[PDB]
Amino acid sequence: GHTETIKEELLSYFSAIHSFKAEFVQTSSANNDIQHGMVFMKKPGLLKWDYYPPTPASIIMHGRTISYYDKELEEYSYSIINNPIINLLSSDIKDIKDIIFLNTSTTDSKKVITIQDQKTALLADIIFNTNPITIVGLNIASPDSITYIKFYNIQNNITIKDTEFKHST
Ligand SMILES: [Cl-]
């Protein structure tokens, strides 16, 4: 409904989450392809994705930087990106800029928050469990495709060393 109340709710739920390690399942309407992996998140900006043998890879995301390690070809790739949406998972909501908070739907002991990125015009739906506060889903929608991510076997506020979000030759 009202935008600033939605901002309050989102920042509360995200403050609750200081980090998480979970398994993820990702799919898209573009195809019938499914993807599985692990995801690590440490709130001061650090995100990491381990994609499983069908597409074996390790991605580390922080702000504008993607670090991609292909484990098959054992190849590294450091690239500058924007991706304001996914990295929102690892974000202090107080600091986040260039975002519109559209809606907040509550139903079935489950909380959904809708936002849009001003630049990319990409929509994001964030799905939390009310009790305990956990991020269980994230969908990203555009006029052409929609992507679904579902997290399971979640571990909120668990210890993860900053050395985890790092690999090198
Ligand atoms: Cl409702």
UniProtKB/TrEMBL annotation:
<keyword id="KW-1133">Transmembrane helix</keyword>
<keyword id="KW-0732">Signal</keyword>
<keyword id="KW-0812">Transmembrane</keyword>
<dbReference type="InterPro" id="IPR004564">
    <property type="entry name" value="OM_lipoprot_carrier_LolA-like"/>
</dbReference>
<dbReference type="Pfam" id="PF03548">
    <property type="entry name" value="LolA"/>
</dbReference>
<dbReference type="InterPro" id="IPR029046">
    <property type="entry name" value="LolA/LolB/LppX"/>
</dbReference>
<keyword id="KW-0472">Membrane</keyword>
<protein>
    <recommendedName>
        <fullName>Outer membrane lipoprotein carrier protein LolA</fullName>
    </recommendedName>
</protein>
